[PDB]
Write a protein that binds this ligand. Sequence first.
Ligand SMILES: [Mg+2]
Ligand SMILES: [Mg+2]
Lengths: 49, 49
Amino acid sequence: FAASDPEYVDTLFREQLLEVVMEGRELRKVAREASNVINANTRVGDVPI
Amino acid sequence: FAASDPEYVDTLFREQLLEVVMEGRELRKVAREASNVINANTRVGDVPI
Ligand SMILES: [Mg+2]
Ligand SMILES: [Mg+2]
């Protein structure tokens, strides 16, 4: 009837797609706080104890 | 023979190569003048009528 969005839902405009994508399951990021972090200069090395 | 150009055609001189490359078949290109060009934001779309 008249002109309503249920008729022209793909004709006069598009349904919004939100610019934000909502996350999947996110696993808990802790390691950087939960341990001492060493920025190594080498892939292999040893720490003195 | 004595000294003839078909003997020394690749030894005393080199055959002429004409500097103009001759064009092949050129098709008639008109669509851009002969229609309305829509620069689209998507591959698949719709136009309202
Ligand atoms: Mg070691
Ligand atoms: Mg469509």
